[PDB]
């Protein structure tokens, strides 16, 4: 069998959205506070993440159905899922060869130790890299990569969400698209969909661990002052 | 006549404090978000000012008497006077030759138009440069420059101050030091002290105009998100 028009244009507008919000040249990185190698890397990685939050909002605004949600639910989904979308999108720059994120040149090549200099520990970073390796080993299509991020964005089991029926519905329609894509357009993808859903579960525990270490970071004023207003707002505990 | 020991060590510890918190090489500027020439210069000048706020706190902590004040009064004085201390200290990089602030190289040479690209207007910038020219034309000693900043810091007519008697006392003792310094150690300074006190009045109206344009800036989220936590806190209206 084959995909329907509606599933097709969902794929189209999603792939187009990722292209509009992800720069493979990483040319905007020179605009960040430069990297330094206590917590020397925090200003750069804070600028990097803040920039990424903005891009995630752009992507989300183009996910079919997201714009129709209430502003509250839009925020609640964005706040809870952000760091996971960041982790998901960051796979595009991750290299299996040197176990790092390569983003333009040697200044913007980020190894595990760089994130250590941002206030984070191996309790987050080793399952992080573990996650990145497994995800990269799936060799996802651009359609599958973009669907997965949209699946994750529209997860109904987030703190703060209200219309858990409408959000579960959008996510289910998105999941239908993915199942269908793998079956029809991905040879030897007999098991891929299951592996991808599992990757969402991994993100949840990655999210939790980051939220713990960030909460540590944000409670110390000498460190929280190195963050950005956007980062503080999105990862902050205000309702 | 001559200066007393106590007036002398007030001068000494003040000059030492300015040296510890002002870098004539401006080498930390490469750590800021780079300058760009809507509101392209805002990230750099926000990083610049935030950095400067930190340096002003360092200076203030070494002003004899400031540390003994309550934390509340310390904040209240710091919040209200900050931008004036910034304007005062920035005279060291101001050049009469090109009417600009030269801070290391051509990237960090700031003309009036650069600040325009930070969300500010000529209603602030032309009395600003007007102020800088007059101050530079005084050709202050390092002792007079450092005393003036400490005079300004300990002004008792600020919003929020409580112990206006103790703060007026410290400022008066500082003023005594200045009057004495000019008389004894500054030839042809017959009128300088009066001119300097007038420069404090100019700062008040400069402060007011900046506070208006900043309030405009801070109310727009797309602009306030480009500021720093420290800037937002110090120039913000919270009590």
């Amino acid at each position: 069998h084959m995909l329907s028009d509606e599933q097709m244009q969902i794929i189209n507008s999603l792939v187009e959205a990722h292209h509009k919000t992800y720069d493979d040249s990483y040319s905007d990185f020179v605009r960040f506070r430069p990297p330094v190698r206590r917590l020397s890397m925090l200003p750069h990685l804070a600028d990097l993440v803040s920039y990424s939050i903005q891009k995630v909002i752009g992507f989300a605004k183009m996910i079919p159905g997201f714009r129709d949600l209430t502003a509250e639910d839009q925020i609640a989904l964005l706040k809870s899922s952000a760091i996971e979308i960041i982790m998901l999108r960051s796979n595009q720059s991750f290299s299996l060869e040197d176990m790092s994120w390569s983003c333009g040149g040697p200044d913007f090549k980020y190894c595990i130790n760089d994130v250590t200099k941002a206030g984070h520990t191996l309790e987050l970073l080793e399952p992080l890299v573990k996650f990145q390796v497994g995800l990269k080993k799936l060799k996802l299509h651009e359609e599958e990569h973009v669907l997965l991020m949209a699946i994750c964005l529209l997860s109904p089991d987030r703190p703060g969400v209200q219309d858990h029926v409408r959000i579960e519905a959008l996510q289910d329609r998105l999941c239908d698209v993915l199942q269908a894509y793998i079956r029809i357009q991905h040879p030897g993808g007999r098991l891929l969909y299951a592996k991808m859903i599992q990757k969402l579960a991994d993100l949840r525990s990655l999210n939790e661990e980051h939220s713990k270490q960030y909460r540590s970071l944000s409670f110390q004023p000498e460190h929280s002052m190195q963050l950005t207003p956007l980062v503080l707002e999105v990862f902050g505990s205000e309702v | 006549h001559m200066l007393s020991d106590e007036q002398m060590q007030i001068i000494n510890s003040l000059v030492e404090a300015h040296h510890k918190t002002y870098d004539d090489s401006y080498s930390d500027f490469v750590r800021f978000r780079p300058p760009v020439r809507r509101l392209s210069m805002l990230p750099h000048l926000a990083d610049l000012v935030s950095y400067s706020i930190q340096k002003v706190i360092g200076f203030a902590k070494m002003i004899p008497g400031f540390r003994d004040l309550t934390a509340e009064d310390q904040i209240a004085l710091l919040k209200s006077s900050a931008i004036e201390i910034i304007m005062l200290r920035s005279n060291q990089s101001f050049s009469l030759e090109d009417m600009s602030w030269s801070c290391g190289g051509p990237d960090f040479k700031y003309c009036i138009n650069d600040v325009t690209k930070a969300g500010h207007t000529l209603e602030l910038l032309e009395p600003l440069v007007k102020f800088q020219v007059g101050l530079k034309k005084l050709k202050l000693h390092e002792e007079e420059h450092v005393l003036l900043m400490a005079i300004c810091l300990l002004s008792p007519d600020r919003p929020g101050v409580q112990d206006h008697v103790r703060i007026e006392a410290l400022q008066d003792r500082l003023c005594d030091v200045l009057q004495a310094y000019i008389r004894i150690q500054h030839p042809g300074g017959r009128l300088l002290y009066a001119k300097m006190i007038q420069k404090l009045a100019d700062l008040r109206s400069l402060n007011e105009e900046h506070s208006k344009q900043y309030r405009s800036l801070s109310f727009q989220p797309e602009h306030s998100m480009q500021l720093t936590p420290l800037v937002l806190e110090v120039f913000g209206s919270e009590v």
Binding site: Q54, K61, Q74, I75, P229 | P221
Partner: peptide, 9 residues
């Protein structure tokens, strides 16, 4: 959430 609200138009 002033920033987020603005960014979401």
């Amino acid at each position: 959430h002033k920033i987020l609200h603005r960014l979401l138009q």
